[PDB]
């Protein structure tokens, strides 16, 4: 999933081609501070999508809630479609 987000930071326009002083001084002083904030934002997004040593601890936030649903008192592989299909056998037979 991090690869699908890294692929859209791959398609980010090269803002460093507009760092020259012929773009600094032709531009509105507030549209240049927005441009320098949008360049500081890409480095925030890119330095956290390449923090791949953080994915191994995000996987441990998914494991314990999944593993408790598998500790079912009925069966590990039980679900609603089977347990509804086995209520049809239980209800539509005699008592």
């Amino acid at each position: 999933l991090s690869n699908e987000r890294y692929q859209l930071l791959s398609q980010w326009p090269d803002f460093t081609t507009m760092y020259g002083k012929d773009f600094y001084y032709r531009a509105h002083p507030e549209d240049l501070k927005k441009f320098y904030d949008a360049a500081d934002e890409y480095y925030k997004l890119y330095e956290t999508v390449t923090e791949f040593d953080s994915l191994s601890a995000l996987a441990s936030q998914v494991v314990p809630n999944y593993a408790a649903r598998r500790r079912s008192t009925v069966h590990p592989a039980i679900g609603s479609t089977v347990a509804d299909g086995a209520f049809t056998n239980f209800l539509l037979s005699k008592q």
Partner: protein
């Protein structure tokens, strides 16, 4: 009142309207993407000392 014939906008107010934003260094794009691609090297290379390939696709032994 000779001071009222001088330009009323200060030398300070020129230097803060001409030099309004601290300009972006040429090298701050290199040394910020390089430190972030050094994490792309670490996790995803196959020669790194900390690859994620044995953590995400565990080896069949």
């Amino acid at each position: 009142d000779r001071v009222l014939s001088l330009p009323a906008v200060s030398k300070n107010q020129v230097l803060e309207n001409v030099f309004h934003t601290a300009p972006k260094a040429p090298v701050e794009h290199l040394e910020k993407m390089v430190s972030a691609n050094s994490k792309v090297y670490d996790a995803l290379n196959l020669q790194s000392k900390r690859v994620l390939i044995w953590q995400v696709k565990p080896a069949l032994f």
